[PDB]
Design a protein around this ligand. Structure first.
Ligand SMILES: Nc1nc2c(ncn2[C@@H]2O[C@H](COP(=O)(O)OP(=O)(O)OP(=O)(O)O)[C@@H](O)[C@H]2O)c(=O)[nH]1
Ligand SMILES: [Mg+2]
Ligand SMILES: [Zn+2]
Lengths: 29, 101, 49, 378, 82, 48, 90, 172
RNA sequence: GGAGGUCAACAUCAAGAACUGUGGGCCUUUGCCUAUAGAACUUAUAACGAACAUGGUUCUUGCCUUUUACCAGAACCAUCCGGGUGUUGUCUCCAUAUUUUUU
């Protein structure tokens, strides 16, 4: 899982938090 | 098209150790020693030979700024269009030079 | 792009602004980028009209 | 197998081929009877470098090459059922498979003595009985050790005087060499067959030299001929969690087992030793590097000289060859023989003609007829 | 992968050139000769054993002893054949 | 081991330190060699 | 790929540059075995296809990488024996 | 990639569409063969659909559609995509059979005779041993009904064994 | 004198793996051989530019009412946005011992 977020969903390149030293979505109409 | 090679004799590399004294030591048969540098694929034998080549000559003309700085290895004895593009020694090459223990 | 290099010309090379500078007719200042964009829009409208 | 695209440019090719036979010392280049030049190299990269230098440096012409294939050999099985005299003077010879230990010792040129053998026959005769366990007679009498296989004289004394034997010994040994150089099935060399001749001026020598080859062809084709293929050995370096992928790939090669698997200490690597047949290996080095994303690398070498029986039956009219799909593993031995005979122009001139290498070409109409009556040799 | 199949380019073809695999397309005297040779060979193996044992540890005596062994074994095989 | 890595990573780390020292510098028995090497070779996966 | 007119499975597609298109490669005489799919014709381009025009030779390999990354928790040191590595027994 | 439950519905739509034209065409045979040689599930769908077409849907079809079903199922049995033993379901008695069944059996045997050729067909019908086809147990009226049916098709040469058995059971 | 400039001019930048200068000899200056001093920048999975556009002519195609405008491959040539390094000028800110060595 992502190194700095701690969530299991995405990859380390995809984490939307700022890289550290150590949600509603439009329904498809 | 085929090799990279030094055709002008005046553009020879300028040999720190005075090659005439090298040729004079060929009279004694125990002074000459023939060593072949064998090993596996991509282990370092051409770059090992290239260290001795660099330390034996004064000014190599084919030496660029990158191979001086140490980014790309000068593969001096690779010498062919095959061995530059394929990145792989396909023919044996050599160098005769004097060295001190 | 990599198959066909187009290999720049390294001699005489008259550049534009370096020769438009040598005239007495051009002058030089520094202004904000958005002001320069608005002035270019006014000038380019006026030329074509 | 190589052939130039424009035949009027054949001399400019041929000259240039000689250049390569100087510069690359591992190649073997020969010109077949059908004009097609066959060349033999160490491996896939080696043939690539050969055809670069032939195409761009030396000949500077365009050549149609075939697709990769291999050099087969051929040998025998259990025993020859019956000695058949051959007359065209009547030389007869019988065949036998060599010892499995003796072939791997003659592959590295050692007995126990060294090449050249039989300059000292007592020293040779001690070795065969001491180690390999022959009788005293054949150990006393070996006429030759040619490159893969042995010619021994058995003999019959009171059938012919040995001065008549040793008057003609050079000619019959040249006949043995000339028969081992090209064999009966597809003019491929014969590898690993113990011959024994059971019963046999200048005109007689020139009658002997082509008759010993025909006799050896009868003697081999009686003794259950089989076809032998060469097997590369493979040295693989992969990361450890990509070990099953390698194993999966070997199942797609048909004949590629994995013997040893060594964990390289202190590195995340794993070094895999296992064999592959050489005719199966036309894209092994590409598939291994693609399917492991560059975390693998193989090297395919042939310096143990191991040769394995090609699975199937050579004398089998019935097995089908599926024409642009690969063969079943039982039809495969027939398939290789027939395609090699059609490359070498042997059978003839026909779409899927079946001139199988039967024994009837050499012997007789009636004697082959009785062999078919007994049902022994189809 | 363009594995020998497919258009050279979709330029003049008025198609997309999209190519796909088809799932619907997967789909005797000579026997007596060798036995005689085997018996005579075994007899000659015996006298070559005699020559090996004699010469291992008198040329004419060993040759005449081998000839007498061939004579005795040939008469013994003429008796054992009938 | 995956559970011990999940919570107490420093104690787990020192466990692997001592066990690796026991494997790679010791006069040690052969069945214990193949068992400890099996532990490492599955520690590559850590209990699938 | 442009010169030989082949398509590696995820890259571009050009025009042939040689668009004009005997019994040597007949069916009866060639042994069909391990198909000569297009990656082999790209990788070793003087061996697998006849008439390679305007073809250059593409850098055989680089040895095998075993760089080990260290991105977890940062409190692991720089020099540390990774769990990927095999032991060095006695 | 239709799911496993709806494969019988797909086979049913293919057969119902095959009936709608004015004649049989090899399109609906080729697509069924390329279905059967893909997976075991399509073959079990066809082995179900043959029984569902003989037991249930025979009574509704006119002779124009039964002739197409005869040529279709005969052309699948003729090239061994369906086993000969799948033909064991049909019985040929006076009580079990119907007119729309017997016309179907006539056209199926017409297709099998055209393709196999009355000598390979003899070999297959001997090797498969269908009790509804060739009743050698007894029951003189039933074997008479079978002999009369196969002579009314135009077979004859199949019937020599059953005629010999019927004579030898009339003579006792 | 020292640092610096979105300042200028002038040389130079793709070639037997490739540069210039000097002395001596041979030919009769060019060139060849021999001894010597220096070579900044660019270059070997080859190039100033880890970036990447357009124009001309002749072939081969594609859209097909004709020309511009076009589709996309090849060969030969040009234009444009930029870059390095060297020399000079200019401008700004500060400053004036007990066996081979010797006991
Ligand atoms: N990482 C790493 N690479 C090295 C080292 N020494 C040499 N190499 C690399 O190894 C590669 C092979 O170098 P070479 O010496 O040219 O290969 P080789 O030993 O001649 O093997 P051949 O293919 O037969 O020439 C080169 O790309 C080098 O960069 C090293 O110390 N560390
Ligand atoms: Mg090398
Ligand atoms: Zn994250």
């Amino acid at each position: 899982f992502c190194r700095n977020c701690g969530e299991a969903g995405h990859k380390e390149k995809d984490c939307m938090e700022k890289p550290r030293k150590m949600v509603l979505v439009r329904a498809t109409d | 098209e085929h090799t990279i090679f030094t055709q002008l004799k005046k553009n020879i590399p300028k040999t720190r150790y005075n090659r005439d004294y090298m040729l004079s030591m060929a009279n004694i048969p125990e002074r000459i020693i023939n060593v072949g540098v064998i090993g596996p694929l991509h282990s370092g034998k051409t770059s090992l030979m290239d260290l001795l080549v660099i330390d034996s000559h004064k000014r190599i003309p084919d030496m660029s700024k990158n191979v001086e700085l140490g980014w790309k290895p000068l593969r001096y004895l690779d010498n062919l269009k095959q061995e530059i593009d394929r990145g792989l020694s396909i023919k044996l090459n050599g160098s005769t030079l004097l060295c001190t223990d | 792009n990599e198959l066909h290099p187009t290999l720049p010309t390294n001699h005489n090379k008259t550049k534009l602004l370096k020769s438009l500078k040598n005239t007495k007719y051009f002058q030089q200042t520094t202004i904000d980028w958005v002001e320069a964009g608005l002035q270019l829009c006014r000038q380019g409208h006026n030329m074509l009209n | 197998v190589l052939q130039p695209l424009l035949p009027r440019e054949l001399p400019k090719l041929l000259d240039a081929l000689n250049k390569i036979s100087k510069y690359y010392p591992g190649v073997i280049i020969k010109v077949e009877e059908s004009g097609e030049h066959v060349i033999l190299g160490n491996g896939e990269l080696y043939m690539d470098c050969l055809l670069y230098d032939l195409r761009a440096s030396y000949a500077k012409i365009e050549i149609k090459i075939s697709d990769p294939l291999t050099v087969f050999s051929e040998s025998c099985s259990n025993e020859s059922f019956a000695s058949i005299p051959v007359s065209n003077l009547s030389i007869s010879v019988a065949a036998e498979p060599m010892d499995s230990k003796m072939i791997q010792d003659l592959s590295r040129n050692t007995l126990g003595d060294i090449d050249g053998i039989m300059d000292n026959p007592r020293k040779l005769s001690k070795i065969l009985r001491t180690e390999y366990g022959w009788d005293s007679l054949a150990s006393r009498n070996v006429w030759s050790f040619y490159n893969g296989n042995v010619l021994i004289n058995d003999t019959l004394p009171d059938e012919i005087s040995p001065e008549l034997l040793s008057k003609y010994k050079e000619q019959i040994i040249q006949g043995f060499y000339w028969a081992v150089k090209e064999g009966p099935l597809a003019e491929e060399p014969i590898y690993g067959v113990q011959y024994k001749l059971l019963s046999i001026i200048d005109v007689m020598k020139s009658q002997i030299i082509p008759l010993m080859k025909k006799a050896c062809y009868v003697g081999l084709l009686t003794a259950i001929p089989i076809l032998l293929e060469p097997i590369y050995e493979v040295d693989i370096t992969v990361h450890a969690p990509l070990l099953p992928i390698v194993e999966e790939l070997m199942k797609k090669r048909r004949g590629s087992r994995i013997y040893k698997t060594i964990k390289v200490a202190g590195t995340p690597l794993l070094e895999v030793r296992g064999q592959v047949p050489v005719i199966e290996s036309a894209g092994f080095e590409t598939d291994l590097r693609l399917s492991t994303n560059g975390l693998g690398m193989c090297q395919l070498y042939f310096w143990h000289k191991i040769w394995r029986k090609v699975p199937g039956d050579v004398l089998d009219k019935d097995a089908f060859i599926p024409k642009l799909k690969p063969a079943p593993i039982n039809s495969l031995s027939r398939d290789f023989v027939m395609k090699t005979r059609r490359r070498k122009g042997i059978s003839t001139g026909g779409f899927m003609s079946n001139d199988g290498p039967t024994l009837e070409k050499y012997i007789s109409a009636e004697l082959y007829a009785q062999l078919r009556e007994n049902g022994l040799v189809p | 992968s363009y594995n020998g199949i497919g258009l050279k380019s979709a330029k003049g073809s008025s198609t997309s050139g999209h190519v796909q695999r088809s799932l619907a397309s997967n789909n005797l005297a000579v026997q007596k000769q060798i036995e005689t040779h085997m018996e005579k060979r075994e007899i000659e193996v015996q006298v070559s054993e005699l020559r090996d044992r004699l010469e291992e540890e008198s040329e004419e005596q060993i040759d005449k002893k081998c000839e007498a062994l061939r004579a005795k074994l040939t008469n013994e095989w003429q008796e054992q054949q009938r | 081991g995956w559970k011990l890595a999940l919570v107490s990573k420093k104690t787990h780390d020192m466990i692997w330190e001592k066990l690796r020292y026991i494997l790679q510098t010791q006069e040690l028995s052969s069945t214990l060699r193949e068992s400890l090497e099996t532990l490492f070779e599955i520690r590559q996966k850590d209990y699938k | 790929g442009k010169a030989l007119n082949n398509a590696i499975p995820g890259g571009p597609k050009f025009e042939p540059l040689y668009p004009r298109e005997n019994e040597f490669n007949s069916i009866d005489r060639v042994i069909f075995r391990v198909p000569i799919r297009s990656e082999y014709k790209v990788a070793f381009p003087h061996l697998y296809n006849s008439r390679p025009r305007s073809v250059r030779i593409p850098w055989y390999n680089n040895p095998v990488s075993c760089i080990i990354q260290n991105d977890e928790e940062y409190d692991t040191p720089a020099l540390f024996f990774d769990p990927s590595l095999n032991p060095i027994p006695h | 990639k239709i799911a496993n439950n709806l494969k019988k519905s797909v086979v049913d739509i293919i057969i119902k569409s095959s009936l709608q034209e004015s004649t049989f065409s090899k399109f609906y045979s080729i697509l069924s063969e390329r279905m059967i040689t893909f997976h075991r599930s399509w073959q079990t769908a066809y082995n179900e659909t043959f029984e569902q077409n003989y037991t249930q849907d025979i009574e509704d079809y006119e002779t124009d559609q039964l002739r197409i079903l005869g040529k279709f199922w005969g052309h699948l049995i003729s090239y061994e995509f369906l086993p000969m033993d799948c033909l064991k379901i049909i019985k040929l008695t006076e009580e079990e059979s119907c007119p729309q069944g017997r016309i179907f059996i006539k056209f199926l045997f017409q297709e099998l005779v055209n393709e196999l050729g009355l000598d390979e067909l003899q070999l297959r019908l001997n090797s498969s041993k269908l009790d509804g086809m060739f009743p050698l147990e007894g029951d003189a009226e039933h074997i008479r009904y079978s002999i009369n049916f196969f002579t009314a098709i135009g077979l004859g040469l199949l019937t020599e064994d059953m005629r010999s058995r019927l004579t030898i059971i009339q003579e006792v």
